[PDB]
Amino acid sequence: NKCDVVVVGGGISGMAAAKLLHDSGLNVVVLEARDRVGGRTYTLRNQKVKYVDLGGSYVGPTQNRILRLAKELGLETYKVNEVERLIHHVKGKSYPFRGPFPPVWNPITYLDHNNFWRTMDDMGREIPSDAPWKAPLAEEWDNMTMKELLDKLCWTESAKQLATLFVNLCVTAETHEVSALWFLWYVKQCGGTTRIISTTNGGQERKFVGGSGQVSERIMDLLGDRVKLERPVIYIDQTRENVLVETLNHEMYEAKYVISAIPPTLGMKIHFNPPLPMMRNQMITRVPLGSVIKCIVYYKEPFWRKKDYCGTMIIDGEEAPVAYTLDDTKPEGNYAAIMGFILAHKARKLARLTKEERLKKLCELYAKVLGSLEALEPVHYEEKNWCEEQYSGGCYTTYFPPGILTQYGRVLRQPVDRIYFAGTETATHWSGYMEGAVEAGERAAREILHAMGKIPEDEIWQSEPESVDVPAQPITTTFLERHLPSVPGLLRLIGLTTI
Amino acid sequence: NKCDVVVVGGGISGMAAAKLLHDSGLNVVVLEARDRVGGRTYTLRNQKVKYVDLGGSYVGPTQNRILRLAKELGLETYKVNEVERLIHHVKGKSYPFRGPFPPVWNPITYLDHNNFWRTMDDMGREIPSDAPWKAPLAEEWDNMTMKELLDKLCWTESAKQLATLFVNLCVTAETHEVSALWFLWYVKQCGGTTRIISTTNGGQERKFVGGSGQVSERIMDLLGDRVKLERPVIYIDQTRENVLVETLNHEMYEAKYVISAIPPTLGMKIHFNPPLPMMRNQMITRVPLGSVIKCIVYYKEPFWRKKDYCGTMIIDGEEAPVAYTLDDTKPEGNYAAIMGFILAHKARKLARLTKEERLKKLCELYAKVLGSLEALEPVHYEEKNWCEEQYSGGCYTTYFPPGILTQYGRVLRQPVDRIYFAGTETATHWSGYMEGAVEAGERAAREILHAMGKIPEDEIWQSEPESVDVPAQPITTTFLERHLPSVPGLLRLI
Numbered sequence: 001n002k003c004d005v006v007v008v009g010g011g012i013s014g015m016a017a018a019k020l021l022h023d024s025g026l027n028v029v030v031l032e033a034r035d036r037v038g039g040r041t042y043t044l045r046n047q048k049v050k051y052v053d054l055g056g057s058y059v060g061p062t063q064n065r066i067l068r069l070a071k072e073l074g075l076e077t078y079k080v081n082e083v084e085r086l087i088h089h090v091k092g093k094s095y096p097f098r099g100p101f102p103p104v105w106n107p108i109t110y111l112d113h114n115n116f117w118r119t120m121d122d123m124g125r126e127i128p129s130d131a132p133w134k135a136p137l138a139e140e141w142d143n144m145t146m147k148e149l150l151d152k153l154c155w156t157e158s159a160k161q162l163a164t165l166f167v168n169l170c171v172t173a174e175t176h177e178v179s180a181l182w183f184l185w186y187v188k189q190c191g192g193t194t195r196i197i198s199t200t201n202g203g204q205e206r207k208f209v210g211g212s213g214q215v216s217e218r219i220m221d222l223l224g225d226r227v228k229l230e231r232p233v234i235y236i237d238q239t240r241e242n243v244l245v246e247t248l249n250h251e252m253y254e255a256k257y258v259i260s261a262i263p264p265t266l267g268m269k270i271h272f273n274p275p276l277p278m279m280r281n282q283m284i285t286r287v288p289l290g291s292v293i294k295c296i297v298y299y300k301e302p303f304w305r306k307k308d309y310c311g312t313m314i315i316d317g318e319e320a321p322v323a324y325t326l327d328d329t330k331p332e333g334n335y336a337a338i339m340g341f342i343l344a345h346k347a348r349k350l351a352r353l354t355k356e357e358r359l360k361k362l363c364e365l366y367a368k369v370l371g372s373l374e375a376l377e378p379v380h381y382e383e384k385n386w387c388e389e390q391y392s393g394g395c396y397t398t399y400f401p402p403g404i405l406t407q408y409g410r411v412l413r414q415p416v417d418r419i420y421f422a423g424t425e426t427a428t429h430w431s432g433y434m435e436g437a438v439e440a441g442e443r444a445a446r447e448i449l450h451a452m453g454k455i456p457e458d459e460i461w462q463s464e465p466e467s468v469d470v471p472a473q474p475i476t477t478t479f480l481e482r483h484l485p486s487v488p489g490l491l492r493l494i495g496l497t498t499i
Numbered sequence: 500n501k502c503d504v505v506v507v508g509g510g511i512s513g514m515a516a517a518k519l520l521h522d523s524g525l526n527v528v529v530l531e532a533r534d535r536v537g538g539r540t541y542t543l544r545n546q547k548v549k550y551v552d553l554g555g556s557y558v559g560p561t562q563n564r565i566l567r568l569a570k571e572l573g574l575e576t577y578k579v580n581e582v583e584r585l586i587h588h589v590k591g592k593s594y595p596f597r598g599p600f601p602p603v604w605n606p607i608t609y610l611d612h613n614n615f616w617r618t619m620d621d622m623g624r625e626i627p628s629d630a631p632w633k634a635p636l637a638e639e640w641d642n643m644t645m646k647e648l649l650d651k652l653c654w655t656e657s658a659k660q661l662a663t664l665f666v667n668l669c670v671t672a673e674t675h676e677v678s679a680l681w682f683l684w685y686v687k688q689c690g691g692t693t694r695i696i697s698t699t700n701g702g703q704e705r706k707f708v709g710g711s712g713q714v715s716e717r718i719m720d721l722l723g724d725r726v727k728l729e730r731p732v733i734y735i736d737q738t739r740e741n742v743l744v745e746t747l748n749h750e751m752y753e754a755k756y757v758i759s760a761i762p763p764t765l766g767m768k769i770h771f772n773p774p775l776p777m778m779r780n781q782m783i784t785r786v787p788l789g790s791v792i793k794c795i796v797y798y799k800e801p802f803w804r805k806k807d808y809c810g811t812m813i814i815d816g817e818e819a820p821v822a823y824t825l826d827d828t829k830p831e832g833n834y835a836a837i838m839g840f841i842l843a844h845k846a847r848k849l850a851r852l853t854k855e856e857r858l859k860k861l862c863e864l865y866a867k868v869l870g871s872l873e874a875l876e877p878v879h880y881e882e883k884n885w886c887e888e889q890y891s892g893g894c895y896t897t898y899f900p901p902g903i904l905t906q907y908g909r910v911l912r913q914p915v916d917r918i919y920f921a922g923t924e925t926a927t928h929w930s931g932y933m934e935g936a937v938e939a940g941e942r943a944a945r946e947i948l949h950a951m952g953k954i955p956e957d958e959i960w961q962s963e964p965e966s967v968d969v970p971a972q973p974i975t976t977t978f979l980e981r982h983l984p985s986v987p988g989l990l991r992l993i
């Protein structure tokens with residue numbers, strides 16, 4: 001019943017908030033809808049896999065908050081396999097390569113690809129991380145889909161196809177579904193194109209030994225009976241001196257403040273008294289989550305390595321159920337496995353199939369991409385379609401359709417009386433990720449500490465020391481990358497010389 | 500506790516469903532979240548206005564279901580005033596006109612405007628009302644916004660500005676917010692551009708004497724204690740023999756079937772056991788409602804009529820708070836008033852102001868457009884910002900952003916075990932309107948009657964005889980309207 005702060009949601013963000021408040025000496029309760037903590041993270045354990053992350057998994061350089069939290073909890077990381085060659089599969093053929101981006105040989109196509117990535121980052125620099133709606137051309141960019149932007153920017157089909165895959169993979173949505181402003185913000189607030197797409201030196205560099213679910217689990221262990229499982233929140237009443245929070249299983253909690261640590265749209269599952277202000281009322285109906293099935297195929301051995309393939313495949317084309325894979329083999333070299341994502345419309349299309357039918361399609365794809373009959377011999381399979389989750393709404397995160405971020409973005413983390421907002425969606429650095437979950441949960445917690453007069457205003461937002469274990473190499477460009485013309489830039493140059 | 504069918508929501512759709520089931524001899528309960536019925540319809544009564552519709556108000560020819568239901572309940576209509584001239588206000592000047600479309604005099608602009616409207620209806624002819632995702636170009640059109648389509652189609656700024664207003668007014672959303680496929684479906688399923696934009700012979704022809712709220716109120720009267728007010732549904736459990744429906748005020752209802760008669764996205768406010776199927780689970784997060792403030796300014800007399808203006812104003816441009824008005828004067832000629840809509844982003848922008856600040860802005864606009872100082876002397880004001888409503892989500896209706904209708908549209912009215920789906924959003928003719936509310940409520944009710952083996956499958960969807968009181972006249976076009984080239988067509992000829 002009675003406490004200082006009720007945290008709604010026991011994912012990483014809610015757990016990080018609750019831990020900070022608990023450590024500060026406050027009495028906290030975490031009300032979690034599911035029979036488990038972790039939310040969009042979920043580590044399955046069984047004899048066949050030992051452990052496997054079926055939700056969020058990867059961490060990397062510049063994600064210093066999740067790294068610090070995990071380290072404090074006694075967790076370790078290991079590096080995702082990228083020793084051997086990556087594969088880009090396009091128009092039914094595989095092209096091995098090294099470095100984060102597939103090589104492009106055609107001079108015109110090269111200019112177009114180079115300009116595409118450069119322009120994404122150029123536009124990103126115009127967008128404040130903490131206020132994307134303040135970008136000089138916010139309205140113009142928000143009123144266009146990523147599809148429209150790619151149609152304008154990409155003078156080759158090659159670049160447009162790879163860019164489309166980029167968007168699908170980053171935000172588990174179609175290019176025509178999402179705002180260009182929001183997408184450009186999302187990439188920029190992860191540190192840019194190179195950082196977001198990279199394994200070595202990027203977001204996919206590492207995983208936690210034993211799974212990411214341990215973050216939320218170990219915090220639950222620290223908090224003991226303060227975490228209440230199978231307590232879906234249905235009602236929040238702020239009309240009286242103390243806030244009243246009611247659960248589906250009929251319990252009532254009373255608190256000074258509340259942290260909402262759930263996906264923004266999932267605030268719709270709560271009836272509010274008094275009603276939410278107009279802007280938040282409408283915002284929470286305008287912010288869907290993406291669509292993805294995470295699929296892990298197990299093999300007797302990591303046989304791809306013998307062919308000098310690391311297990312990374314970037315697979316273009318409608319027929320391919322999976323557009324991206326990574327080696328998911330244990331650091332010990334056993335439980336050989338390939339992780340793949342079925343993205344956006346394909347998650348909808350292929351959800352119709354049986355688990356066995358999806359396994360077959362994935363193996364047949366991998367056999368072709370890897371030129372390896374061994375891919376047709378899986379030993380085990382695990383998968384999770386996040387689209388079916390009542391208490392997530394999708395994965396990885398919330399996307400903004402055209403027009404929404406400028407009109408409603410400012411209220412995303414604006415407090416509503418004594419309700420403060422956590423959740424990765426409200427972060428300003430790696431929003432959408434476990435890192436963002438920690439940033440937002442701790443910031444929301446500190447907003448409450450400030451409201452209680454326990455800390456000064458300048459302590460609400462806090463910098464994070466760089467990890468000593470996972471140092472971040474800077475993102476660099478070459479002179480040629482900086483200065484080579486775009487395709488229309490080249491055509492202008494040609495038209496000028498021929499005059 | 501125990502009944503045959505629980506209807507969630509006591510708007511027109513839920514009430515129409517409940518009435519049909521009740522009349523068929525089933526025991527029905529309507530669970531309504533608010534302390535009132537009517538939902539997106541709301542008639543306010545006070546001495547100053549007598550009555551005023553602050554929500555849905557207009558009905559017209561081809562909307563035979565709402566007309567039949569209202570007539571049965573003892574309601575009458577009257578005609579919205581369209582005797583005198585309409586006004587199109589463009590680049591700071593008023594241009595009076597007659598007929599449903601504002602005239603264009605420049606020959607290039609004429610071809611562009613003519614082509615715009617014609618093309619909307621041309622495209623609509625390929626979109627099945629009951630399955631827009633089956634349009635031959637469904638994916639191509641769904642993956643584009645209306646902004647993109649208008650950018651392609653409109654060779655003049657004049658046409659683009661008017662087309663933009665058209666979209667904003669029809670669906671209370673920006674052109675860049677909405678799917679082209681969904682918008683073209685929406686217009687087509689109302690009978691096309693002429694029918695949707697017309698007062699005389701169209702959707703805005705009539706209002707109900709005493710207000711549209713009387714539809715839901717009078718059905719509540721018929722059902723008596725079967726309607727439970729202030730019972731927001733929070734939980735639906737279908738794991739057992741009978742469906743269990745729980746309300747926020749702790750009550751439990753048990754039924755054979757449920758009708759969900761709430762806006763699709765408001766399904767999110769209900770916790771489901773077992774969880775919803777994947778497609779519906781995500782669908783209900785992808786379907787927002789539009790944004791609108793409905794504003795009624797009252798005057799001593801309908802002074803505009805003296806200048807041979809009917810009170811209809813179509814007002815282009817960003818600066819104007821209100822893009823469209825109609826005369827809201829009572830049939831008796833008293834309670835003179837102008838109804839105006841503050842649409843889409845302007846609803847968001849102007850919500851920050853006080854009621855008095857909005858009144859001043861509207862009066863000053865109307866004085867400019869009507870060319871009358873009388874507009875500066877209001878006697879009363881009423882308004883309603885539908886964006887603030889927890890149990891509507893907005894008004895008039897649900898819009899589909901790009902990519903959604905093709906991917907999720909088919910599950911809108913697909914039953915989930917023993918839950919059937921009503922609500923105007925699930926209609927196939929005048930979806931978005933009170934007419935669609937009736938169609939969907941009655942159809943959902945009949946799905947349940949069929950599930951119970953009480954009627955055959957071919958009786959689930961039923962035709963409606965034409966109203967004798969509000970007969971429809973045909974929509975016509977001229978030879979020149981049909982055959983004049985577009986701007987690029989004229990350029991190809993050159």
Ligand SMILES: *Cc1cc2c(cc1C)nc1c(=O)[nH]c(=O)nc-1n2C[C@H](O)[C@H](O)[C@H](O)COP(=O)(O)OP(=O)(O)OC[C@H]1O[C@@H](n2cnc3c(N)ncnc32)[C@H](O)[C@@H]1O
Nearest residue numbers: 009011013033039040056057058233395423424432433434
């Ligand atoms: C699903 C997914 C996510 C993911 C990804 C791959 C998949 C398939 N890959 C990632 C990766 O490699 N690295 C990374 O950093 N992130 C990755 N993501 C995203 C990541 O999982 C999320 O960003 C993060 O886990 C989000 O954390 P957050 O704490 O913000 O949100 P949550 O996990 O969704 O937790 C919300 C909790 O609230 C509970 N809930 C929901 N509604 C209620 C109500 N009404 N009452 C009480 N509790 C509620 C949920 O059950 C959940 O536990």
Ligand SMILES: *Cc1cc2c(cc1C)nc1c(=O)[nH]c(=O)nc-1n2C[C@H](O)[C@H](O)[C@H](O)COP(=O)(O)OP(=O)(O)OC[C@H]1O[C@@H](n2cnc3c(N)ncnc32)[C@H](O)[C@@H]1O
Nearest residue numbers: 508510511512532538539555556557732894923931932933
């Ligand atoms: C708001 C509006 C609507 C409108 C319009 C102008 C405005 C400002 N102009 C119209 C017009 O001139 N002519 C016309 O035909 N329609 C016009 N519209 C739209 C019209 O009002 C709607 O199409 C129609 O009213 C919709 O009816 P429907 O029955 O389908 O939906 P509803 O009215 O929203 O009713 C839903 C009810 O459900 C209750 N509710 C919501 N959640 C719950 C839960 N969880 N539990 C129980 N009840 C719930 C709502 O309170 C509501 O009463």
Ligand SMILES: CNCc1cc(=O)oc2cc(OCc3cccc(Cl)c3)ccc12
Nearest residue numbers: 100101102162165166169170196197204
């Ligand atoms: C930021 N989005 C999350 C994300 C999770 C992931 O597991 O792999 C990615 C791989 C990505 O890029 C791989 C890549 C490499 C080369 C070209 C293209 Cl298009 C994409 C981008 C994002 C991700």
Ligand SMILES: CNCc1cc(=O)oc2cc(OCc3cccc(Cl)c3)ccc12
Nearest residue numbers: 599600601661664665668669695696703
């Ligand atoms: C479809 N939407 C509902 C609707 C309610 C209404 O009250 O007036 C309208 C007026 C409309 O059109 C008026 C009009 C006339 C001439 C040109 C343009 Cl752009 C619009 C269209 C829809 C409506």
